[PDB]
Amino acid sequence: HHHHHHHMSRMAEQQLYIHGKFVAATSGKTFETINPATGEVLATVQAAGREDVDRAVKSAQQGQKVWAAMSAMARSRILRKAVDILRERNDELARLETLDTGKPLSETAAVDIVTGADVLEYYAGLIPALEGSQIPLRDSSFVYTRREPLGVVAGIGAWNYPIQIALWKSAPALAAGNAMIFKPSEVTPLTALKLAEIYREAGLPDGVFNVLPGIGAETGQYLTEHPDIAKISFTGGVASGKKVMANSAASSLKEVTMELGGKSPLIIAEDANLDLAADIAMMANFYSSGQVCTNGTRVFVPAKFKAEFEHKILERVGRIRAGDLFADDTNFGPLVSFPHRQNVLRYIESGKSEGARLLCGGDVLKGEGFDNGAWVAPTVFTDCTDDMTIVREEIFGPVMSILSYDDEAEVIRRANATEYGLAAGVVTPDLNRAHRIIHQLEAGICWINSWGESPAEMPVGGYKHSGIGRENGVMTLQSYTQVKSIQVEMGPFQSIF
Amino acid sequence: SRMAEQQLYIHGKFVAATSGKTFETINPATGEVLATVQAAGREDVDRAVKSAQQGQKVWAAMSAMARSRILRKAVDILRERNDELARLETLDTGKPLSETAAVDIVTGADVLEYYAGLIPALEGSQIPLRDSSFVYTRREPLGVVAGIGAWNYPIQIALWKSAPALAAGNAMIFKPSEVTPLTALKLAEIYREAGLPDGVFNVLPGIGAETGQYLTEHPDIAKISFTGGVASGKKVMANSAASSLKEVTMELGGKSPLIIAEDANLDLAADIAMMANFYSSGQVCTNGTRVFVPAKFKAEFEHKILERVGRIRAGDLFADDTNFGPLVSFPHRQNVLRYIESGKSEGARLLCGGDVLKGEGFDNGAWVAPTVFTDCTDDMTIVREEIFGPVMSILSYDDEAEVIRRANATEYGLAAGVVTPDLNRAHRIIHQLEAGICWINSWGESPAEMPVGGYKHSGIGRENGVMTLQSYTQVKSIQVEMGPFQSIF
Ligand SMILES: NC(=O)c1ccc[n+]([C@@H]2O[C@H](COP(=O)([O-])OP(=O)(O)OC[C@H]3O[C@@H](n4cnc5c(N)ncnc54)[C@H](O)[C@@H]3O)[C@@H](O)[C@H]2O)c1
Ligand SMILES: NC(=O)c1ccc[n+]([C@@H]2O[C@H](COP(=O)([O-])OP(=O)(O)OC[C@H]3O[C@@H](n4cnc5c(N)ncnc54)[C@H](O)[C@@H]3O)[C@@H](O)[C@H]2O)c1
Ligand SMILES: [Ca+2]
Ligand SMILES: [Ca+2]
């Protein structure tokens, strides 16, 4: 059964969002966002120029002062109103996210906005608990501290969880009393513009959340260079993260936090149930079509279990349902873009070339309704070794690498023998093995007998080359403030002169 | 006589460098060479990092209280050797013994003692999600970190950087200023005598653009803590950004305002301004070098400043009564003198000083007289730029809103202060100032408990306080899932 008559016309040209309204860019620059399931253009999108960025900062400086002068509970109520709107519009926002990203609606309608709103809801309730300290020195003197807003901060987003990233960056920044200028990925700009409208409808003062689509090397760099931005929070690849660090270091002194992906290990212990292990390995590799920074893409399996484990993976890969992204039963989508597919395919070819055994997948999906999409089959390599390119490098597609191991000390060494350090996990029913292995792994995000859950309360970020700083949890609210120490000297000051 | 040629400190002992590079540290009171000092080369730095990697593992495997006791032993030694260390600091820096013997080691050891006691309180958290799952976090050491020190408070900076780093379970490689490398080497020996494991505190003298750069570029250093000027701080930020991903914290000086309120007692205000400008001969990063005085009080305030400047006692740096020294080096004196000449050339009125000290016993040292400019305006070079010498700029003002604006009209933001007996004025002014370190009716006290660092271009991050101990750990989040994991595939 063929499915045609599905032309979707273009959206309106997308503008910038500055100071509570859409405004035309003055860059002379536009770019297109493409539906990765069909190749059709979703919208032409305007890119913010240097003067547009400067106006956005001045808008943010003005809005931040209004926002910071409110009470803590007034701020809490406005962010909760935005949460309420996000819950009401979940399905509509999820459909837009599916169009822009290629992720199944079964994901976007249950995870992306749900968990993005979860984090905003969490920080909204913590605003009144944000406190300084008081330190007695002696009867005649004491110190108190204030946690003051930084001012105007910049968030730079990635294309795999667009609205979730926008919410996870903006929520602590705004709750700490800052304004944020958010630069979405040029691959997926659309839901960030919706979020800005929602924030306005909730009562957020004009300028406190401005959204600037544009190209990383242009708009993004204009932001990192601006002298009045106090902090940058970046999600994306290592290459662009290094440009952001370098450009920010060359400009006004600012703090930079970063989440840069990884090559996270999944350690299947010698006492693990292999159905559970296989279920975890599937969720650690093929959710959002393998486009998750925390994926467990090095799956370490005991040699004695490798043959059986491979069969359990093949059985579950055979259940994956690629298809209509709006269909209830679809759980696998195209990649986010055709250029990204080309890169993933180059990684797959290196796996073949370097002698890994192809267990399944390894090609594009074919036939009517896949031929127009950026699809890559769910792919598993086995007989992998630690020197292979597919094992060493983040692929960001549906490519699992199975590595066999002999003993626990060995697998810990190998799990840690990476420049990366984002996530890790272990499958074992044993109390001592679970905690003792996890305590030795050099990663910031660790799952035991699970994968992927990221509660609002739980700080997440990378060790080593996978990141600086954390997101979520109480600590991240604090990191969007700066400490002022104040000493009150009530005794007579003694000069030596 | 000259000291013995100074070597690197790596893995619990002094070791000859392999750079082919030496430099001289000069006694700024005499111009004489104190010592020839070896500089660490690129291969020396790599050996220091491997030593620190080995030592950090021993250190971090000890119990918390075992680490506390060793740092407390070092405190005990520092208290006992206070005067000897102070005398060496005075030779290397030119600061009077009346300062070094009362402040530098005393407050450096205060911060080490503070953090030693806090190690056992460093905790993670636990977060219940539901009956079948919970999260817990660990605060883990970073590994090997680097501190890069400045020349005005050499051993105090070495202790304020190493104390939280070591207390959190890290090893630190410390790079002292090439102007003042001597007390950091003494500190390294003291830590070993206290029982610090070999490699946990290594000291690499050398030139900033060589040794300093090799450290900031090394792939296995997890964090850089830097104190110094803006220009060198920018180089450190850029070189670190081009190298391994690492966090960098920085304290970079300021042009801090002291606001004298219209209801202030002017004797108190003059006393605070003197202490905010002429301690350590003006070589303190938090100095209140823009002194804002109500127009109605300016004449009387100047008389009171002149009276107290007239009392300053420059002389024998080991005499009890001396309270003013030469500057740290002859190159630094030249730069301060250029600032003084610009204040003259731009039309500021010289109230006092403005020249070198002269005569027997001053002619051979890097002395600049305590200097005060008045009739200053906000566009003047001496008002806009950090001098790091004994140069006060007096600026008159008319109203409270104006002085708040002008106080904040700087790229800097390290410290600030206000002098006022009024409750509302004191707190309301301070809450509006864009600075990290704020003093009411005082200046310069920096308790171990109090976090200190800069706003805006004066810094990133904080030192001292509970938060700095936490800042030398990294958070690992661990989810324990006890229910049956659900896969959608
Ligand atoms: N969650 C993550 O950590 C994550 C997300 C997406 C991609 N990645 C990785 O990054 C790789 C490359 O992806 P990509 O090139 O499509 O994304 P990218 O990493 O270049 O994009 C991330 C963001 O950075 C911006 N950016 C890029 N260059 C910039 C610059 N010079 N200054 C400022 N901002 C700049 C982009 O516009 C976008 O907003 C992917 O293949 C994947 O491995 C990681
Ligand atoms: N407490 C402070 O913030 C402080 C201290 C001293 C000087 N200063 C300011 O800085 C000005 C310049 O002083 P300076 O040049 O004699 O000191 P600096 O700021 O250059 O030196 C500080 C430290 O930085 C190191 N350093 C320099 N270049 C480096 C590099 N490329 N990589 C790594 N480390 C490097 C130096 O070796 C030294 O250890 C002074 O006039 C004063 O205004 C501020
Ligand atoms: Ca798109
Ligand atoms: Ca010297």
How buried is B146 (Cβ within 10 angstroms: 0-12 exposed, 13-18 middle, 19+ buried)?
Answer: buried
Provide DSSP, B304-365: HHHHHHTT--BS-TTSTT--B---S-HHHHHHHHHHHHHHHHTTPEEEE--SB--STTTTTS
What is d(CA B425, CA B259) in angstroms, rounded to the nearest whole number? 11
Distances (CA, A) of B355 to B255, B288, B338: 22, 21, 11
The set of residues, in sequence order, having a beta carbon less than 8 Å from that of B482 and lying 6+ positions away, is: A449, B132, B133
**For B269, which residue in chain A has the nearest alpha carbon?**
A493
Tokens (6 digits) for A292: 């998750």
Same domain, A231 and A297: no
| Distance set, CA A341 to CA A92, A286, A366, A393, B247 (Å) | 27, 15, 14, 16, 33
Same domain membership, residue A159 and residue A220: yes
Q: How many Å apart are CA A359 and CA A243, to the nearest integer?
A: 37
**How many of the other CB atoms lie within 10 Å of CB of A440?**
14
- Nearest-angstrom CA–CA distance, A468 and A470: 7
Count other Cβ atoms within 10 Å, centred on residue B413: 25
B252 touches chain A (CB under 8 A): yes
Cα-atom radius of gyration of chain B, to the nearest Å? 24
Which residue do the tokens 């966002």 mark? A33
Sheet with A423-427: list strands edge to edge: A357-360, A379-382, A399-405, A298-302, A265-268, A423-427, A445-448, B473-481, B133-141, B126-130
CA distances from B329 to A88, B29, B30, B183, B353 (A): 68, 9, 10, 17, 19
Choosing from A422, A448, A474, the residue where a domain stops is A448
Residues of B in contact with A469 (CB under 8 A): 247
Characterize the bridge pairing of strands B349-352 and B247-251: unpaired
Note whether residue B481 is domain-resident. no
* Cβ neighbours, 10 Å, residue B198: 18
Residue B410 shares a structural domain with residue B290: yes
Q: Which helix (H) or strand (E) holds B175?
A: strand B171-175
**Encoded tokens for A208:** 């406190």
**Measured in whole angstroms, how far is the alpha carbon of residue A414 from the centre of its chain?**
26
Q: Of the candidates A418, A117, A155, which has an alpha carbon nearest to the alpha carbon of residue A264? A: A418
Discontinuities in chain B with C to N beyond 2.5 Å fall right after none
What is the spatial distance between Cα B159 and Cα B165, in angstroms, rounded to a whole number?
Answer: 10
Query: Beta partners for A257?
Result: A233
**DSSP three-state, residue B285:** coil
- Max Cα-Cα span within chain B: 89
The CA distance from B152 to B251, in Å, is 13
What gap in Å lies between CA B237 and CA A248, rounded to an integer?
Answer: 9
Q: Which ligand is nearest to the CA of B92?
A: 4
Question: What number of other Cβ atoms are within 10 A of residue B80's Cβ?
Answer: 11
Among candidate residues A345, A333, A347, the one with its CA nearest the CA of residue A292 = A333
The CA distances from residue A343 to A239, A338, A348, B130, B342, in Å, are 15, 9, 9, 40, 59
Nearest alpha carbon to residue A387 among A363, A409, A362, A356: A356
- Please state at what angle helix A190-201 crosses helix A72-88, rounded to 10 degrees: 130
**DSSP helix/strand/coil, B222:** coil
Structure-determination approach: X-ray
- The Cα B454–Cα A484 span in angstroms is 9
Residue B458 DSSP symbol:
G
Strands A231-235 and A255-259: parallel
Ligand 4 centre distance from Cα of residue B443 (Å): 27
What span, in angstroms and rounded, lies between the C-alpha atoms of B412 and B284? Answer: 15
Q: Confirm if A361 and A316 have CB atoms less than 8 A apart.
A: no
Segment 265-284 of chain B within 8 Å of chain A by CB:
268, 271-272, 274-275, 278-279
Residue (of B202, B461, B149) closest to A468 by Cα position: B461
Considering the domain architecture, whether residues B228 and B299 belong to the same structural domain is answered as no
- B50: exposed, middle or buried (C-beta count within 10 Å: 0-12, 13-18, 19+)? middle
Is the CB of residue A459 less than 8 Å from the CB of residue A472? Answer: yes
* Domain-located, residue A491: no
- B364 and B462 belong to one structural domain: no
The boundaries of the domain holding residue B409 are 257-440
Which residues on adjacent β-strands are paired with residue A447?
A: A425, B479
Nearest chain B alpha carbon to A278 = B487
CB contact under 8 A, A253 and B456: yes
Contact yes or no for B10/B29 (Cβ under 8 A): no
**Token output for A210:** 């401005």
A264 lines ligand 1 (CB under 6 A): no
Number of domains within chain A: 2
- C-alpha closest to that of A152 among A121, A176, A128: A176
CB of A221 sitting under 6 A from ligand 1: yes
Given CB atoms, is A486 within the 8 Å cutoff of chain B? yes
- Between CA A207 and CA A59 the distance in angstroms is 5
DSSP B282: G
Nearest-angstrom CA–CA distance, B479 and A449: 9
Domain CATH for B71: 3.40.605.10
Residue A389 sits in the same domain as residue A477: no
Q: Taking each helix axis from N to C terminus, what angle separates A162-175 and A190-201, rounded to the nearest 10 degrees?
A: 40
Of B337, B315, B332, B326, which Cα lies nearest the Cα of B365? B326
- In Å, how far is A487's CA from the nearest CA of chain B? 5
**Contacting A residues, span 169-208, partner chain B, CB-CB under 8 Å:** none
Residues B72 and B115 in one domain: yes
Rounded distance, CA A359 to CA A398, Å?
13
DSSP code of residue B211 = I
Please, are residues A326 and A413 in contact by the beta-carbon 8 Å criterion?
A: no
The DSSP call for residue B120 is G
- Resolution of the experimental structure, in angstroms: 1.8
Nearest to residue A360, comparing CAs of A333, A331, A300, A320?
A: A320
Q: How far is CA B418 from the centre of its chain?
A: 22
Q: Which residues line ligand 2 (CB under 6 A)?
A: B 148-152, 175, 177-178, 208-209, 212-213, 216, 227-229, 232, 235-236, 251-253, 285, 335, 386, 388
- Secondary structure of chain A in the HEC alphabet? CCCCCCCCCCCCCECEECCCCEECCCCCCEEEEECCCCCCEEEEEECCCHHHHHHHHHHHHHHHHHHHHCCHHHHHHHHHHHHHHHHHCHHHHHHHHHHHHCCCHHHHHHHHHHHHHHHHHHHHHHHHHCCCCEEEEECCEEEEEEEEECCEEEEECCCCCHHHHHHHHHHHHHHCCCEEEEECCCCCCHHHHHHHHHHHHCCCCCCCEEECCCCHHHHHHHHHHCCCCCEEEEECCHHHHHHHHHHHHCCCCCEEEEECCCCCEEEECCCCCHHHHHHHHHHCCCHHHHCCCCCCCEEEEEHHHHHHHHHHHHHHHCCCCECCCCCCCCCECCCCCHHHHHHHHHHHHHHHHCCCEEEECCCCCCCCCCCCCCCCCCEEEECCCCCCHHHHCCCCCCEEEEEEECCHHHHHHHHHCCCCCCEEEEECCCHHHHHHHHHHCCCCEEEECCCCCCCCCCCECCCHHHEECCECHHHHHHHCEEEEEEEEECCCCCCCC
Provide the residue count of chain A: 497
Give the list of residues 6+ apart from residue A436 with CB closer than 8 angstroms, or none: none
Do both B20 and B117 map to the same domain? Answer: yes
Asked if A156 and A232 count as a contact pair (C-beta separation under 8 A), the reply is yes
Residue B461 lies in a domain: yes
B398, B401, B402, B403: CA torsion to nearest 10: 90
The helix/strand/coil state of B204 is coil
Q: Which residues contact B168 (CB under 8 A, 6 or more apart)?
A: B119, B122, B139, B141, B142, B469, B470, B472, B473
Neighbours of A87 (CB within 10 A): 12
> B181 — phi, psi (to 5°)?
-90, -5
Q: Do A135 and B238 touch (CB under 8 A)?
A: no
Q: How far apart are the first and last CA of chain B?
A: 80
Neighbours of B347 (CB within 10 A): 11
Nearest to B252 by CA among B393, B386, B433: B386
Query: Which residues lie closer than 8 Å to A5 by C-beta, 6 or more apart?
Result: none
- Three-state DSSP class for B40? coil
Other C-beta atoms within 10 Å of B484: how many? Answer: 10
Residue A5 maps to a domain: no
Question: Could you give the CA distance from residue A478 to residue A15 in angstroms, rounded to a whole number?
Answer: 33
Quote the CA–CA distance of A274 and A279 in Å, as a whole number: 8
Residue B456 annotated to the active site? no
Which positions ≥6 away from A28 have C-beta within 8 Å? A49
Cα B74 to Cα A177, B149, B200: the distances in Å are 42, 20, 13
Whether A495 and B274 lie within 8 Å, measured CB to CB: yes
Distance CA B337, CA B356 (A): 8
Listed in sequence order, the residues at least 6 apart from A256 whose beta carbon sits closer than 8 Å to its beta carbon are A231, A232, A233, A234, A244, A245, A248, A468
C-alpha distances (whole Å) from B276 to each of A222, B279, B454 are 39, 7, 17
Cross-strand partners of B175: B148
Contact residues for A395 (Cβ-Cβ < 8 A; gap 6+):
A290, A297, A344, A347
The DSSP bridge pattern shows strands B133-141 and B473-481 to be: antiparallel
Phi, psi of B454 (to 5 degrees): -105, 150
Q: In sequence order, what are the beta bridge partners of B440? A: A488, B418
Active site residues of A: 169, 259, 293, 471
Smallest CA–CA separation between B1 and chain A, in Å?
33
Adjacent-strand bridge partners of B224:
B146, B248
In a domain, B2, yes or no: no
Instruction: Please give the Cα distance from A34 to B63 (Å, whole number).
Output: 57
Q: CA distances (Å), A107 to each of A340, B94, B313, B483, in order?
A: 20, 67, 75, 22
- CA–CA dist A144, B439 (Å, integer): 11
Read out DSSP for B395-448? EEES-HHHHHHHHH-SS--SEEEEE-S-HHHHHHHHHHS--SEEEES------T
CB-based contact A461:A467 (threshold 8 Å): yes
Pairing assessment for the beta strands A41-46 and A30-34 based on DSSP bridges: antiparallel
Q: Name which of A15, A23, A14, A13 is nearest A55 in CA terms.
A: A23
Beta carbon pairs, A and B, within 8 Å: 197
Other beta carbons within 10 Å of B36: 14
Q: From CA A388, how far away is CA B76, in angstroms rounded? A: 54
Taking an 8 Å cut-off on Cβ atoms, the answer to whether B237 and A260 are in contact is no
Residue A301 near residue A405, CB atoms below 8 Å: yes
Interface residue B407 vs chain A (CB under 8 A): no
> How far is CA A483 from its chain centroid?
27
**What is the C-alpha to C-alpha distance for residues A38 and A374, in angstroms, rounded to an integer?**
8
The whole-angstrom distance between residue A221's C-alpha and the CA centroid of its chain comes to: 19
Q: Which atom of ligand 1 is nearest to the CA of A223?
A: 33
Tokens matching residue A172: 């602590």
Strands B8-9 and B14-15: antiparallel
Whichever domain contains A396, its CATH number is 3.40.309.10
Output phi, psi for B329, to 5 deg: -160, 165
Round to whole Å and give the CA distance between A213 and A201: 21
B251 belongs to the catalytic site: yes
Ligand number nearest CA of B366 is: 4
Cβ contacts of B331 within 8 Å, gap of 6 or more: none
Q: Is residue A495 situated within a structural domain?
A: no
Q: CA separation (Å) from A58 to A64, A193, A206, B301, B407?
A: 10, 19, 11, 40, 21
Please indicate, yes or no, whether residues A25 and A104 belong to a single structural domain of this protein: yes
Q: B247 and B261: one domain? A: no
Residue in the structure block whose two tokens are 């460098």: B17
Q: Which residue has the tokens 């109230």?
A: B351
Domain assignment present for A9:
no
Distance from CA of B246 to the nearest CA of A (A): 7
With beta carbons less than 8 A apart as the criterion, state whether A184 and A31 touch: no
Q: Residue-wise over B228-240: b if at least 16 C-beta within 10 A, else e?
A: bebebbbbbbbbb
Buried b (16+ CB within 10 A) or exposed e, A158-193: bbbbbbbbbbbbbbbbbbbbbbbbbbbbbbbbbbbb
For chain A, say whether B307 makes contact (Cβ under 8 Å). no
The answer to whether residues B241 and B228 touch, using CB atoms and an 8 Å cutoff, is no
Could you tell me the CA-to-CA distances from B137 to A394, A457, A492 in Å, in that order? Answer: 26, 11, 46
Q: Find out whether B203 and B187 touch, Cβ atoms under 8 Å.
A: yes
Q: Are residues B201 and B287 in the same domain?
A: no
Alpha carbon separation from A322 to A92, A102, A334, B486 (Å, rounded): 22, 11, 8, 19
CB contact at 8 A, A463 and A421: yes
- Please tell me the distance from the alpha carbon of residue B329 to that of residue A111, in angstroms, as a whole number: 62
Chain mean position to CA B39: 22
Q: Are residues A156 and A194 in the same domain?
A: yes
Which is nearest to A230 in space by CA: A448, A436, A30, A64? A64
| Amino acid sitting at position A485 | S
What is the tally of helices (H) and strands (E) in chain B?
16, 20
Query: Mutate which of A487, A489, A490, A494 to disrupt the B interface (most B C-beta within 10 Å)?
Result: A487
Tokens 């730095």, residue located: B45
Cα dihedral A384→A388→A391→A395 (10° resolution): -130
The candidate with the shortest Cα–Cα distance to B419, out of A493, A484, A133, is A493
Whether B283 is in a domain gets the answer yes
Nearest-CB residue to A487 (from B133, B445, B459) = B445
Cβ burial, residue A287 (10 Å; 0-12/13-18/19+): buried
Asked whether A82 lines ligand 1 (CB < 6 A), one says no
Q: Do A483 and B436 touch (CB under 8 A)?
A: yes
